[PDB]
Symmetry: C4
Subunit: 330 residues, 4 copies
């Protein structure tokens, strides 16, 4: 073994991230304005725009969830607050019309009671929200929700970064699988635990387990540019979840911060000291970006451009596009 | 598949850019001063110097086109202006003697009328100027021009970054194929759409489709140093198109800008907000470089040095040179 | 041979360091709080926490050794001081209860007398401390100690970076093998001598020689984050030795230094000019980190997180985890 | 072909530089102080220290040549001065005892007359000094010198970066071959001409042509640290030529320059505008380093350390050492 030892499987794969690849152009009869950007969030739920906002307390509360749904995507309400307040935020979103909304739950002692309160409030999607879903407690939670409320509510499980973990969630009854261990902009899992998987390889592996069973993959974490959304979907994901890219918008929680003459908003990991009060997230800031509607317009515009370049009339066609791998000289 | 999934073709190639390679020296009887730098711009048109200026409104109007032709190359007049004005710039170049000139046209509603006005003004080369030529509308335009005015005017099509796209332009009747999707210094296609192809690999692939049919390849975008011109031609291109390297010259459009005691000129993508008024270009500045004649002298001097090192008496011999691939430690 | 010459063995391997890999998550029934972090320091000695402090005069004297043992690890007392003083530091550690302690010896003229004084003071572990243990003088020292005092004292040999060197120490009777040639944060062996081995590959190779004989490997040098400890153990090491990560703690030797409003402590290589008075170490500073107990808590917390993600109930299970190799885009 | 086109030989090799590799330690009975650092400069001339100073007007005139010879190496006098003055510098070196000295000549009109004046002055080594020796004019010069004065004077030819070029110089009668196209610290050949070869691969290839014929290789350019000297020799070179590493010494030409409170000396390429008055070198400065004797002591000290780590008793044994290739994470 050229990298050491006598076991070829010790280093099991070469992991690629978004910056390691570009989409290859292909023959196209598709104009960006004419592409169809709709895609499955879950087995049953299709979004007009393949984007969902992160379940984070500096990204998604009712205002963001309402704005995301109006824009054609969806928000996932964070769970760092009392059950009653989270359920009230679901109701608030529903007071603004026939808008889709999701909400995060954990696997702890109060997670089931949280899920039932969200159900009663009319939530459309429950996201079982963990850093590592390949665990009997997480799989049991997904299965029990699906068996209990799965006729009326779609159940998402995550996060995973391997084929086997994705397969386990599929077996448990997940209506979608969320992919990303380590890639988030505010994440320190890779430095604290030394654990992770580069996101393009993680998506390719998860899709190999999920697509044969008709289960969509949500690419969660590490997206920095609109072009990364196109790369995530071309790797086989059906939607992308965004934290950093949406945290600086008017509709996110938090106030404006002025630093050296420039405007910022606070953005922090849910595993940061601040959010919890051994952290696996940090607390920082991102530039202020203005209204959500305008950010989504630019992100979808980039996606539409990719669809034009690759000849993809639909997201399902984009999922079949090819990559070229690039070097550091990039 | 070591990088993920079960499909070896998902990542279709490893893309190299200029900074990934160096030309290997070889046995030489060639002195730099004695090398022949002439090369085909198109099937019928040979230039004394294998360089053409970009069709950009901060690079090529009549002054630059005149200077480029006098230097042994050619300019391609930009099309971000009324048809009458572009045709008048062609006439202005012709008032300065028997000088070659090209001009860009699009594929939109007024593109045909633009092409005919340029024809009437005495243009030598029409460049069908798109970000992605592998499209029936672009191919049809190339073919219709070739069939209509192709006895008197050479028709260039672009841009492409793949073998199949190059082959399609050849089939459509292109007299030259222009290569470059994503590599321009002011380009944001790779970050906005996530689409592109590293330029050495793009040229190698395009040449594999074009050279067997006797169609020259124009390497367009990403050239930063004179040595990059030699690399582009050794990869098989017949000429190089330059934007950034020529934008800071006296002959480019625009005035001098003084910033922190240094001199600059404005340089912007034609897909930038400023040029258009979802942008795929930015607006910036490059250092002021003085007269065009002096810049071309240094660029051709570097090319001549490469020809001496590689034993290439002609550009056709340089196209057969070999590379060594280098690492980040470079 | 693609990299030059006609001998494929001239470049014998591709060396990976900590930053080249990540641990892959795997199926887990392990909660971080419930993982067992104990591991063999030597054949006979098991630590509660798999961490030992470097034998350096800016890291380990009696205060650090006492604190490390109380925290569940061990200190190795440095040998840059008179024999009588080093032996007195061993006695000081013993005055604080039933605490494990190690101490470094060289192979020079006074090394044997040093070892016997340490023996008489009640040392538990003797570390034969060299930059390159694959040498008859070092191997003889290890063997002679083992034959003379090996019933009452565990004998560690190092350092090595190759399989053959590790095998030689095992043959000589080493109770543990310490791995690391070149990777230390204050080390200049790689720039001065041009010699070294990236630490993940060095550990994989040393473990291939040591594990079949039941001899634990101590990963020494280059660890910068808690996640690196998990990577070192997953590569097959049984403990990690830390210098930089512990040098800024209250318990290390040296006073606080104030620079530009921030607090630091001095940290220097034992091969630096300062320590010796052709240096192979430098003298610098690291941020002040507060009490040792708190640093160890965060480091072990990260290790525990890795054990949870990889489904490792014990360190022996963690040694079987798998990696993904990452690119520069990381 | 994964990198483009249909020709696997277009990219002929993967080129490694010094920073791409480390020397592997091996079993050693060698103490640094006891290693033998002597090595062949040419077929007939053996140096005590395997180092020669560059033929540059900011590195080697008589003072440096005298100091280098006294230190056990040799200087090569630059040729950017009248023939009479260069010959007088040779005589000056000879007035200081039985000291070896070399001198550069070109291949131009006055090169033969220069060589004969140097011969008459008692030069020991003539270096045919070109950027690309694979050329009939350079090969003819080497052969004619060897046939004319080769009984009394050793004739070095260079520079080369390929096996075939090295073989040609050997055939022409070279007593040593100097390797390096593009790697010099002040060199811009790689950016101006786009031509070069990473130096470890260049040495491995040149040695494959030279060693079978008993012709030593001089590694010239790109050495930044003492460890690079050990790497160059382990790749198979017999000596190293140094420019940058010696330009800041007291014995180099030029005065002290004070910039922002620090001391520097001027260092410039012989192909820079300043030296010539299309440049392939730049003009800059390097830190002042003090006496040559002290710099050589540190460089040889690093070499001696490498010999100890690799178990190399002699330079011929070091030439058989092995490498590990490292990544960017290095
Ligand atoms: O504290 C944390 N540590 C690690 N990952 C986090 C943390 N908080 C949120 N995440 C994940 O990071 C994603 C956002 O990543 P981003 O879009 O790159 O900023 C979220 O959707 C989570 O999956
Ligand atoms: O706005 C833009 N976005 C992307 N590419 C552009 C844009 N404008 C011009 N280009 C291309 O960039 C080339 C110049 O690249 P440069 O020489 O690297 O600056 C031009 O010849 C075009 O092919
Ligand atoms: O001067 C030196 N040069 C090279 N390595 C050293 C020196 N001093 C200590 N070391 C080694 O560096 C280790 C600490 O590495 P660190 O934890 O990366 O700072 C120590 O345990 C030694 O193995
Ligand atoms: O102007 C120049 N351009 C390119 N190489 C040069 C020039 N002048 C000297 N050299 C070479 O650079 C070597 C010194 O490289 P250095 O030790 O890396 O600074 C010299 O021995 C020459 O072989
Ligand atoms: C550290 C942790 N354990 N369980 C949760 C929930 C968290 S978190 O608050 O920090 N959020 C996430 C979410 C997704 C992640 C992917 N990698 N790391 C992640 C962390
Ligand atoms: C975004 C776009 N679509 N069509 C055009 C024309 C443009 S442009 O104005 O921005 N010019 C170019 C030209 C070449 C390119 C290669 N990659 N991207 C490019 C952009
Ligand atoms: C240069 C030297 N020779 N012998 C010793 C002891 C030293 S040291 O003081 O500098 N310590 C170490 C320890 C471990 C090392 C791994 N690589 N280099 C190292 C240096
Ligand atoms: C550009 C040139 N042609 N001939 C000479 C002599 C020169 S130089 O003055 O610039 N010196 C060197 C010497 C070695 C080199 C390796 N690569 N480039 C080099 C340049």
């Amino acid at each position: 073994v050229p990298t050491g030892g006598d076991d070829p499987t010790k280093i099991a794969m070469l992991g690629l991230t978004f910056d390691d690849v570009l989409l290859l152009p292909a023959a196209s009869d598709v104009l960006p304005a004419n592409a169809d950007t709709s895609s499955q969030l879950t087995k049953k739920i299709r979004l007009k725009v393949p984007l969902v906002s992160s379940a984070m307390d500096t990204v998604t509360e009712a205002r963001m969830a309402i704005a995301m749904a109006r824009a054609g995507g969806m928000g996932v309400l964070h769970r760092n607050l009392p059950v009653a307040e989270q359920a009230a935020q679901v109701e608030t979103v529903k007071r603004s019309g026939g808008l889709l909304v999701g909400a995060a739950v954990g696997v702890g002692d109060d997670a089931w009671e949280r899920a039932m309160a969200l159900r009663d409030a009319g939530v459309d999607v429950l996201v079982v929200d963990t850093a590592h879903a390949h665990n009997r407690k997480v799989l049991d939670m997904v299965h029990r929700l699906k068996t209990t409320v799965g006729d009326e509510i779609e159940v998402v499980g995550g996060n995973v970064a391997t084929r086997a973990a994705a397969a386990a969630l599929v077996e448990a009854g997940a209506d979608a699988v969320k992919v990303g261990v380590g890639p988030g902009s505010i994440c320190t899992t890779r430095v604290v635990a030394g654990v992770g998987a580069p996101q393009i390889t993680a998506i390719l592996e998860a899709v190999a387990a999920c697509a044969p069973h008709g289960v969509p993959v949500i690419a969660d974490g590490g997206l920095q540019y609109s072009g990364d959304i196109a790369k995530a979907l071309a790797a086989g994901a059906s939607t992308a979840m965004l934290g950093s890219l949406l945290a600086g918008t008017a509709e996110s929680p938090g106030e404006l911060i002025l630093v050296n003459g420039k405007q910022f908003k606070s953005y922090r990991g849910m595993g940061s000291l601040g959010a919890m009060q051994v952290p696996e997230g940090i607390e920082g800031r991102v530039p202020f970006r203005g209204p959500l509607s305008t950010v989504i317009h630019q992100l979808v515009g980039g996606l539409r451009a990719a669809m034009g370049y690759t000849g993809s009339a639909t997201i399902e066609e984009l999922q079949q596009a090819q990559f070229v791998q690039i070097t550091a000289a990039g």
